[PDB]
Amino acid sequence: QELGNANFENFIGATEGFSEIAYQFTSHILTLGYAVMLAGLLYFILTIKNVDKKFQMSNILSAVVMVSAFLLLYAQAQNWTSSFTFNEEVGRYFLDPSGDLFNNGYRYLNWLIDVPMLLFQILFVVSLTTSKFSSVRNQFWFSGAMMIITGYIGQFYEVSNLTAFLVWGAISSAFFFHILWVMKKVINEGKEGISPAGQKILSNIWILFLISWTLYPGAYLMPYLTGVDGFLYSEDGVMARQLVYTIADVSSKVIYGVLLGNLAITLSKNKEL
Amino acid sequence: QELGNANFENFIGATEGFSEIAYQFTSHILTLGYAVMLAGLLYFILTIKNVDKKFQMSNILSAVVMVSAFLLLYAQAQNWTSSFTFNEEVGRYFLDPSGDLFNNGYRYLNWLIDVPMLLFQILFVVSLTTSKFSSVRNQFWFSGAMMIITGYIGQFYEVSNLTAFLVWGAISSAFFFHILWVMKKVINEGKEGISPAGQKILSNIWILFLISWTLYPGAYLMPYLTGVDGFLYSEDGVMARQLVYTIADVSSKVIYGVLLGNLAITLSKNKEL
Amino acid sequence: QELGNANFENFIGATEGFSEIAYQFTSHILTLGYAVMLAGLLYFILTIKNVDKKFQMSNILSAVVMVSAFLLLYAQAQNWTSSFTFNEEVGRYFLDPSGDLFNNGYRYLNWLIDVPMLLFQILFVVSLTTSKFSSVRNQFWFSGAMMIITGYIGQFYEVSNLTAFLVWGAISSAFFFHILWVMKKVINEGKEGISPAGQKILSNIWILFLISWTLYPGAYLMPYLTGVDGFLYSEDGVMARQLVYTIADVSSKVIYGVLLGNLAITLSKNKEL
Amino acid sequence: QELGNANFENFIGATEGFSEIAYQFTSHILTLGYAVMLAGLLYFILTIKNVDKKFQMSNILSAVVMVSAFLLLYAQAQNWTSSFTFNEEVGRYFLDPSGDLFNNGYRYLNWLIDVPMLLFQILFVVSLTTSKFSSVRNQFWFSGAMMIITGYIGQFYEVSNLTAFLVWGAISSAFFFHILWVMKKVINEGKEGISPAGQKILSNIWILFLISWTLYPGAYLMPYLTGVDGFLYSEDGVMARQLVYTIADVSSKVIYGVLLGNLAITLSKNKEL
Amino acid sequence: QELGNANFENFIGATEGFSEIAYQFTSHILTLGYAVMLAGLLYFILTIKNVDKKFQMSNILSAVVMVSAFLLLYAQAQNWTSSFTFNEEVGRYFLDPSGDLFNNGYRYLNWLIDVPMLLFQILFVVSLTTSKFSSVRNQFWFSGAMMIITGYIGQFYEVSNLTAFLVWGAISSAFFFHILWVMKKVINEGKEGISPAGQKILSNIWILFLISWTLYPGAYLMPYLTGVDGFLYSEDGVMARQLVYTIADVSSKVIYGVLLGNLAITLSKNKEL
Numbered sequence A, B, C, D, E: 001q002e003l004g005n006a007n008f009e010n011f012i013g014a015t016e017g018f019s020e021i022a023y024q025f026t027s028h029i030l031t032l033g034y035a036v037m038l039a040g041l042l043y044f045i046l047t048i049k050n051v052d053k054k055f056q057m058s059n060i061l062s063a064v065v066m067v068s069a070f071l072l073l074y075a076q077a078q079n080w081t082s083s084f085t086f087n088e089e090v091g092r093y094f095l096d097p098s099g100d101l102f103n104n105g106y107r108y109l110n111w112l113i114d115v116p117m118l119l120f121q122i123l124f125v126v127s128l129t130t131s132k133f134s135s136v137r138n139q140f141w142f143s144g145a146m147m148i149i150t151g152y153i154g155q156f157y158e159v160s161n162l163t164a165f166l167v168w169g170a171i172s173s174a175f176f177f178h179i180l181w182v183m184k185k186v187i188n189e190g191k192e193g194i195s196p197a198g199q200k201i202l203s204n205i206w207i208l209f210l211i212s213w214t215l216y217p218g219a220y221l222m223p224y225l226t227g228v229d230g231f232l233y234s235e236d237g238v239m240a241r242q243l244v245y246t247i248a249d250v251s252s253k254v255i256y257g258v259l260l261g262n263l264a265i266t267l268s269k270n271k272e273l
């Protein structure tokens, strides 16, 4: 069957199909995904006034990100269930092309909201020392955009052209490393002149940021992480990818947002944790 | 017809089918489910300022849980009606696999929000005495997650492998008992140093918590509670399961949330009740 | 064909079909239904601060009821259009079972929100004299639930078993009379020690309550109110039922809520109308 | 084909079909419709505190009307696209009865919200002199309802029975004239003893009211305004009808609401325009 | 296949079909579109109180525009996926007419909100010097409407009648140039008597306005910008058009709104940036 430049889910779906567990789990984890985001939207709105005025833009940007992530994860949940249909005879879910091919690209372009806003929002909580606000913001946003767009092109080829997949991935990675570099700088300057309590939180934020963001290129590579005809080039790999996205999404957006809120409280003149 | 690792609803649906009453009731009770949750969302938002600032996080977390539960119960309501279709010739609803198999697993993974947040939220109303806040929270969250994940694996096998069903269920149960243990401690420490009115409420909360949470493993076992080829391995058991979920959901989320709100009022310096 | 324990709409739909007017009107009146409820939701939220704090729970409970009623009436609007499909050859809408049978039972189980909350909410406006708050509430809620549950069982049989229909209906009626009894008591005690203006409103509330609530058993019986093979056992009776529900819904929920709000204003120490 | 008592859209749709332009425009204009209403909902909520408390009920009722109109226009937009399907062979959209016949009656019954509330809401801005508040309200509401109900019956016959169409239309018209009469009285009494600024606005409101409300019987007659086999008994007439509704809807609801808000500001003791 | 007065997307879709990348990208970019708008809605509401009262109408009108754009872009996202269906045999998406033809006309009529409101809203932030507020508003609104309506007629013919396409486009362009003229005047008068910081922002607003608004006629012409049978009369041109719309939409609505908000802050007597 002729699929072209399509994600590997569609190939598994079209040949082997998915077991009840594989299909249902993938559905469940996406559903949990979008549920978490809408719950988070409510949380961040409802807690705006828990911090001093100057910090409240962080709450607002969290909320912005929640909207994006909800809409996407919801749309993608539906895309999953439309793309694969139960076959009675064998008792597995197979590619139903009338529902469109499944594509992870939805996530990527929506990152053009999430990434810039997540990177931006810390700059409303921490004070920089030697770095300039506008400079950091511009570096974040440029490298963010390039990271995403290059990756986005990559993933179309994850089956059809493994070379293009890896080369685009590599280029993307370069921009990723730049972001890591700049964020580390920000975190360090953030720590300067604040309580030990706030410094502990920023330490935690950095570890959360580093792990959670790294999951995303993890999900990129997922089908191939056990090499050719490996364990992960299978319904098991499909499950793994969406699990990793969901963990990454919750970590990088919600928990990140919560920790920033907690930092904002410690830095607030009225309030205490 | 090969169904595999699927819930028992699909087996009843595929062999006997469901009567008008069985199909419609199941539909109605899920609808009532999600209606209750959205109504609850409104209630908890609209009553935030009925309690002192420090208590208001309980209202917010109630609201968070309402969002999760609404989304899930709504999604599951639709799943029910898509999965079973009327057959004119016999006048019963039968498995329609084009709608996907029905699976209760949606609930389980969404509990990864509900359970942690419900356990968490009491710690914003009551003061601990001998226990440490972070300790209780960590025990709740770890045991919560393990309870859910093990159960989630179990339920896939409730027909296909009765042994796996029961063993996973048993392991889950161990974690459940731990939670019960910790919550009892919390309730007792909560009672110390507060009005008799607030103590009465916490007494009620404990009974509500104990019954409502125990319904959930009840629903797990439901098809087998009258043994093999029992009364409950039938459309009657299908109805019963979703009824029990809905009672449990309303009790454990809404009423629980309401009682905590009432406790918060009694502990509030301004307010009376 | 074999329909079983199904509402009479499905029997009309399956034999005679519905005319354009009958089908469209039923659709229109349900649509108006849910529109009214969402508009009411807005009204009750937006007018919360028009009354003293102590009265504001009445506004909140109105809002709660609006959410329930919206969701249900919306869902039921869609159920109507899915259940009956145009036949080109004869030019009438006939039962389309692929859409599920139509069932009024959706309403009934959602009353488990509406009824308790509507009865409850007056107790936040009026002061009782000789009666106890918790006593009245418990009687309302118990008799409410029994009324609904017994009726709910009844209506499944409105075609399939006329005896069961009437017996369950009769039992339901007993609990209805109890509620009427208790509400009358409440209204009388409410009138004691308040302005003539507030007393006039409570007089109006009682008449509204009595008529509007009585429409509901009216809708129950509707197909049979002109006896066997009567005028109303027809598409005309189908129309009539849903019209009566919608009148009853608007009266018993919205207008009731509005009048209570007006009462709350007169009893409010700052406020004037 | 046998269509029965159906709107003329369905007859054009069933015989000639609709061109790309006719089908798409009708779709676009309904979409614009419901978009305007939801935008208006936001506007009216967000501007509540721009006027003195006593005037704020006008904002609230505007908002109520917006909800109704949104829901309806949205529902009707979907009805349009479901009712007419592209035929490849000829390249026109034809009646698809599996989607139900299109009916304008949805609008009419929703007017049972819109009309009463629009007429009501002015009575919260202007002061009457010689007329009684409750008297005007009752006349508005009675004549409103009769206007709508009679018209609603009429439009079912606009093809099937031209006599009934015109007679019901005529009766409706009588009630319309009564409303015009009463509104003129209200406007004049409104003008008495208020600033020149407020008087100018009421002058504008009257012209807006008169034109916008008259469009609605215009849309009623639309197919026949060029007589038999005229220009307008065609896809061109279908387009025209929905355009006129949309102009009327925006004028009679949104702009009307805006002008009243502006009047409320001029009459407000705190505020300036 | 007879398509008639239809957009060129449908012709590409009906002959060549779309590759995975072309179909998916178009879907992704529209999704990002509507996501951005809903996020923007939240932002503009949540930041109303960040500026002095007099400026807050700009926030409200931003919000209004967000609602319109969300609804449209959402609706259009769905229209895309309904209009083109995967063909298994060749592995390309082809026109599926059961989903309706795709038409960009949805956008145009919704501009009847967006354009007037965007032009209007600046007049609440800047002070005019030479010009009259009502005069500028009327010129904006008249020329806006004429621009849109003429363009709207044009685009129906972009394939079927290239002459009509270009003539209507030309007429539209005339009105566009008028708007540019008036806006330039506004921006210059805005700069007079305000801080250098606010002047820099208005400089930026002008460049943003000029580029972003010019993209829209760009998208109009897109298929023909490489002449006959050029690179862009292809799936590549389809992609390009929707990319350009989305860039234009984000720029002209969100970023424009953000910059105005920033200007409002600098002009605010309480607040600083």
Ligand SMILES: CCCCCCCC/C=C\CCCCCCCC(=O)OC[C@H](O)CO
Pocket (backbone or CB within 6 Å): A112, A116, A141, A145, E255, E258, E259, E262, E273
């Ligand atoms: C190919 C394009 C890729 C698209 C993705 C690129 C990232 C852009 C993200 C958001 C822009 C939102 C617009 C906000 C513009 C104003 C920012 C600003 O004013 O700066 C903050 C201010 O200094 C503090 O007060």
Ligand SMILES: *C/C=C(C)/C=C/C=C(C)/C=C/C1=C(C)CCCC1(C)C
Pocket (backbone or CB within 6 Å): A111, A114, A115, A118, A147, A148, A150, A151, A152, A154, A169, A170, A172, A173, A176, A213, A214, A216, A217, A220, A249, A252, A253
């Ligand atoms: C909320 C969403 C977030 C934080 C997304 C982050 C995405 C990345 C860090 C993506 C990184 C990638 C690489 C570094 C290589 C492969 C391509 C990407 C874009 C997945």
Ligand SMILES: *C/C=C(C)/C=C/C=C(C)/C=C/C1=C(C)CCCC1(C)C
Pocket (backbone or CB within 6 Å): B111, B114, B115, B118, B147, B148, B150, B151, B152, B154, B169, B170, B172, B173, B176, B213, B214, B216, B217, B220, B249, B252, B253
């Ligand atoms: C709002 C949802 C709640 C409170 C869910 C609670 C779920 C449980 C207490 C589940 C318990 C289970 C067992 C103890 C055994 C079987 C597996 C579970 C997960 C159903």
Ligand SMILES: *C/C=C(C)/C=C/C=C(C)/C=C/C1=C(C)CCCC1(C)C
Pocket (backbone or CB within 6 Å): C111, C114, C115, C118, C147, C148, C150, C151, C152, C154, C169, C170, C172, C173, C176, C213, C214, C216, C217, C220, C249, C252, C253
């Ligand atoms: C908002 C919904 C309300 C107020 C519903 C009220 C329902 C009733 C009063 C139902 C009464 C019934 C009887 C007394 C006999 C037949 C069975 C019932 C439940 C319809």
Ligand SMILES: *C/C=C(C)/C=C/C=C(C)/C=C/C1=C(C)CCCC1(C)C
Pocket (backbone or CB within 6 Å): D111, D114, D115, D118, D147, D148, D150, D151, D152, D154, D169, D170, D172, D173, D176, D213, D214, D216, D217, D220, D249, D252, D253
């Ligand atoms: C927001 C909706 C409004 C203001 C609707 C107004 C409707 C009318 C004024 C209808 C008038 C009619 C006639 C006077 C004759 C034909 C039947 C009607 C109902 C369309």
Ligand SMILES: *C/C=C(C)/C=C/C=C(C)/C=C/C1=C(C)CCCC1(C)C
Pocket (backbone or CB within 6 Å): E111, E114, E115, E118, E147, E148, E150, E151, E152, E154, E169, E170, E172, E173, E176, E213, E214, E216, E217, E220, E249, E252, E253
């Ligand atoms: C938010 C939407 C906006 C700002 C839309 C702006 C639209 C235009 C500036 C359209 C311009 C056109 C021309 C000048 C020629 C072709 C026809 C139009 C309407 C696309």
Ligand SMILES: CCCCCCCCCCCCCCCCCCCC
Pocket (backbone or CB within 6 Å): D138, D141, D142, D145, D146, D149
């Ligand atoms: C306290 C407020 C009092 C409101 C009284 C206003 C009454 C308006 C209700 C309208 C009822 C119209 C009844 C029409 C009957 C159907 C006849 C249609 C002709 C065939």
Ligand SMILES: CCCCCCCCO[C@@H]1O[C@H](CO)[C@@H](O)[C@H](O)[C@H]1O
Pocket (backbone or CB within 6 Å): A162, A221, A224, A225, A227, A228, A229, A230, A233
């Ligand atoms: C950095 C990690 C990248 C590892 C690249 C390994 C490439 C795997 O090789 C690929 O495996 C597929 C699935 O088994 C096969 O279907 C393909 O034919 C094969 O090219």
Ligand SMILES: CCCCCCCCO[C@@H]1O[C@H](CO)[C@@H](O)[C@H](O)[C@H]1O
Pocket (backbone or CB within 6 Å): B162, B221, B224, B225, B227, B228, B229, B230, B233
């Ligand atoms: C604590 C409750 C667990 C008891 C397990 C009950 C054993 C059920 O046994 C099962 O019953 C099914 C339905 O009757 C049969 O179809 C299966 O063959 C049988 O394995």
Ligand SMILES: CCCCCCCCO[C@@H]1O[C@H](CO)[C@@H](O)[C@H](O)[C@H]1O
Pocket (backbone or CB within 6 Å): C162, C221, C224, C225, C227, C228, C229, C230, C233
């Ligand atoms: C108290 C109100 C209840 C009145 C009961 C009336 C009995 C109706 O009798 C029923 O009428 C149906 C409709 O034609 C027939 O199809 C049934 O066979 C018949 O039993």
Ligand SMILES: CCCCCCCCO[C@@H]1O[C@H](CO)[C@@H](O)[C@H](O)[C@H]1O
Pocket (backbone or CB within 6 Å): D162, D221, D224, D225, D227, D228, D229, D230, D233
């Ligand atoms: C303006 C209000 C009165 C208008 C009445 C016009 C009479 C229309 O007459 C009708 O025209 C239809 C369309 O051409 C024909 O198909 C019908 O046969 C004819 O009865």
Ligand SMILES: CCCCCCCCO[C@@H]1O[C@H](CO)[C@@H](O)[C@H](O)[C@H]1O
Pocket (backbone or CB within 6 Å): E162, E221, E224, E225, E227, E228, E229, E230, E233
């Ligand atoms: C200002 C830019 C306008 C240039 C318009 C000239 C291009 C018109 O060229 C058109 O190309 C189409 C596909 O490429 C063909 O199908 C048409 O037959 C042809 O007229």
Ligand code: NA
Pocket (backbone or CB within 6 Å): A080, A081, A082, A083, A084, A085, A086, B098, B099, B100
């Ligand atoms: Na599926």
Ligand code: NA
Pocket (backbone or CB within 6 Å): B080, B081, B082, B083, B084, B085, B086, C098, C099, C100
């Ligand atoms: Na079904």
Ligand code: NA
Pocket (backbone or CB within 6 Å): C080, C081, C082, C083, C084, C085, C086, D098, D099, D100
């Ligand atoms: Na239908």
Ligand code: NA
Pocket (backbone or CB within 6 Å): D080, D081, D082, D083, D084, D085, D086, E098, E099, E100
């Ligand atoms: Na269509």
